[PDB]
Write a protein that binds this ligand. Sequence first.
Ligand SMILES: O=C(O)[C@]1(F)O[C@@H]([C@H](O)[C@H](O)CO)[C@H](O)[C@@H](O)[C@H]1F
Ligand SMILES: *[C@]1(C(=O)O)O[C@@H]([C@H](O)[C@H](O)CO)[C@H](O)[C@@H](O)[C@H]1F
Ligand SMILES: [Ca+2]
Ligand SMILES: [Cl-]
Length: 383
Amino acid sequence: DPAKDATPYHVEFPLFRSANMASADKLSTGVGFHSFRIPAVVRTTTGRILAFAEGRRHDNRDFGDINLVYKRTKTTSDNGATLSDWESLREVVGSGDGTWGNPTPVVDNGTIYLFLSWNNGSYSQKGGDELPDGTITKKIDTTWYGRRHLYLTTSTDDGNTWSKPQDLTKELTPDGWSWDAVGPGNGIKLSSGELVVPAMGRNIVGRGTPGQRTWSVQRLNGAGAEGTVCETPDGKLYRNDRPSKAGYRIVARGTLSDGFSDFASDSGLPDPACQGSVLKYNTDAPPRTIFLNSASSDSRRQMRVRISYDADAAKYDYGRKLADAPVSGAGYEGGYSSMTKTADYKIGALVESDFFNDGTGGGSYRSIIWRRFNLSWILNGPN
Ligand SMILES: O=C(O)[C@]1(F)O[C@@H]([C@H](O)[C@H](O)CO)[C@H](O)[C@@H](O)[C@H]1F
Ligand SMILES: *[C@]1(C(=O)O)O[C@@H]([C@H](O)[C@H](O)CO)[C@H](O)[C@@H](O)[C@H]1F
Ligand SMILES: [Ca+2]
Ligand SMILES: [Cl-]
């Protein structure tokens, strides 16, 4: 791999700082957040980087009052290289005391499309959870009021402002569903121009052209709830999803016109039942797909970034442990992740981190780390 010839480069620092941290991130209104979790990142066509997260107001739990927050790089050409290159925290949407989450952006010229999930603030995935005011949650159900909704918000000004989110549940989530998720992480634009956004049991597919997109659903029997998608070097689609039980990533390959294979466990990619991320890096010799998850069947703290050179992303190298370049003072790193390719030819990654001050409890502060590294950094890892 000729990219190994570059000097290894890596930088890493917290970008979304929980309430316990010195420079805890708050909106300009004064509204702060206990925890940030569920990252999504995209480089726009200007080179600006947009980083999204769930701002979890009161504790780290997946329900209750959660706002969709973000940061942009200050300019289109700084590549988020230092903390001072990032704007202050902003909000995409935070209306109501319900949950706005699952950021899943896709860039289309320019327009950034950001798909989100939402639930009512009286409901949770399991039900029976206690809220700050003493209310007990109802379990997410199939009713309009109590089901998981799918929203779309758009930016046509490089992420500066966002349209009021539009509820596309009736159009893009099957009737009768209760739980739902989009991404989280990112959607993609194919070499042939279609937009493909991974979601629970389905792709959301944007046909048409830039400036005139039309959305529909490609259902995928056996897909995960939290999916990732990319275009492999052979031109086909590749779903690499979180499994329902700890063990291994589940994978399927297909096309928009012919559909997908069934999903199968990939024994080369252990996973502890956690979200992952995938990135098409380049098309020229040699073609590369990047994959990032916790490379373990029982821990989220074994984050590993990897490269596949296969036309179908069948097999990956060992890659490199993110712990080889650890961050201090921002918790124990590991969990959900998102990757993009920066305009200065780095991998830019967001990774969850957990202070663990309340163990697995709701009071444990969660932060999100930003990382940049070149391919060389991965390739020069001790395997
Ligand atoms: O509901 C919230 O989280 C909030 F506290 O109020 C939201 C909103 O003004 C109200 O919920 C009504 O839409 C803000 O967008 C949030 O930043 C925050 F201030
Ligand atoms: C995530 C997690 O940290 O495990 O889990 C998902 C969801 O519960 C699982 O995919 C099972 O359906 C949450 O939606 C997400 O917020 C995060 F908690
Ligand atoms: Ca809110
Ligand atoms: Cl999910």
